Amino acid sequence: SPKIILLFSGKRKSGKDFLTDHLRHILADKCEIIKISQPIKTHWAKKEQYRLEMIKWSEEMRNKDYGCFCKAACENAAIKPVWIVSDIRRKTDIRWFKETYGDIIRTVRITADDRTRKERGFQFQVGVDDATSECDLDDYNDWDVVVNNGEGRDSLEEQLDSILKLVSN
């Protein structure tokens, strides 16, 4: 298996994608990036057009088998000491990872205040921002790391170091 699996959660415009991308570049060939939405995009290939056709379909597939997209994304991942799962959204995603891989999971939440998100171009979109996809982990209470990436955030170097501390041994 991988030695550690980092599950990243965050709302859009939080900077989770920015931080995961920096972390991937730093860890280079010690890590694999995994996107559990990739099986959904790959099924579609075989923007509102994507959402209209895929949101209800993916919700129904996950309602029938909570791990379907997590299993598909992990089956296709190269084994590397560190796995970065950049797009965990639901409690059932964390549940599937913990059931499958046990105590090598670490959960990381990236957060940003609404003023900061608006500076990054955030405009409230009903049905995106009120949706399970953006809100299902808002009340999760078992985070290993929470990264403030809004008002009062640490330096980018210190943010990355707080995550790298998880994989440094």
Side-chain angles (χ1 to χ4, degrees), residues 126-157:
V126 62
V128 177
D129 302 310
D130 271 348
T132 294
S133 195
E134 286 283 308
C135 294
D136 199 51
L137 291 171
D138 291 357
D139 62 349
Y140 190 69
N141 293 314
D142 194 33
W143 302 115
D144 293 302
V145 173
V146 178
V147 181
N148 173 10
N149 196 37
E151 188 67 8
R153 62 179 180 179
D154 302 319
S155 69
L156 172 52
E157 180 172 330

Side-chain angles (χ1 to χ4, degrees), residues 12-168:
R12 68 191 188 92
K13 301 305 207 310
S14 58
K16 162 188 62 75
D17 293 345
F18 169 93
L19 286 164
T20 54
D21 197 49
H22 275 82
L23 276 160
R24 161 207 211 149
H25 290 312
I26 292 170
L27 287 175
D29 289 350
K30 296 173 186 182
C31 81
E32 180 74 353
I33 308 313
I34 300 175
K35 297 183 192 302
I36 63 167
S37 65
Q38 186 70 68
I40 303 166
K41 300 175 205 309
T42 294
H43 186 262
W44 169 250
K46 302 183 164 77
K47 196 165 66 196
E48 185 58 25
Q49 268 202 22
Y50 171 75
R51 299 183 45 94
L52 285 163
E53 300 218 21
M54 295 314 285
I55 286 171
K56 202 55 172 43
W57 178 87
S58 62
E59 276 184 278
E60 293 177 350
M61 294 296 292
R62 193 188 295 109
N63 286 343
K64 292 208 311 234
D65 176 10
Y66 63 97
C68 53
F69 298 121
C70 297
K71 278 181 287 191
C74 292
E75 281 169 4
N76 295 323
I79 295 170
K80 296 276 196 175
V82 183
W83 274 12
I84 303 171
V85 184
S86 67
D87 64 345
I88 291 294
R89 290 178 176 274
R90 288 166 171 82
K91 293 164 164 170
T92 49
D93 298 326
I94 297 173
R95 190 153 179 196
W96 181 88
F97 271 94
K98 289 183 171 193
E99 287 166 357
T100 301
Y101 288 107
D103 293 335
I104 71 174
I105 302 315
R106 308 284 182 271
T107 60
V108 183
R109 177 67 164 193
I110 313 301
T111 193
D113 64 286
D114 284 323
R115 178 172 182 182
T116 295
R117 290 168 84 212
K118 286 174 322 213
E119 299 183 23
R120 296 171 182 160
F122 179 85
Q123 176 163 295
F124 188 89
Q125 288 155 7
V126 62
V128 177
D129 302 310
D130 271 348
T132 294
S133 195
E134 286 283 308
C135 294
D136 199 51
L137 291 171
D138 291 357
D139 62 349
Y140 190 69
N141 293 314
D142 194 33
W143 302 115
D144 293 302
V145 173
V146 178
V147 181
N148 173 10
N149 196 37
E151 188 67 8
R153 62 179 180 179
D154 302 319
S155 69
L156 172 52
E157 180 172 330
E158 199 144 45
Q159 295 176 313
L160 293 164
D161 290 356
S162 75
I163 302 161
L164 288 164
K165 100 176 212 291
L166 289 178
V167 299
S168 188

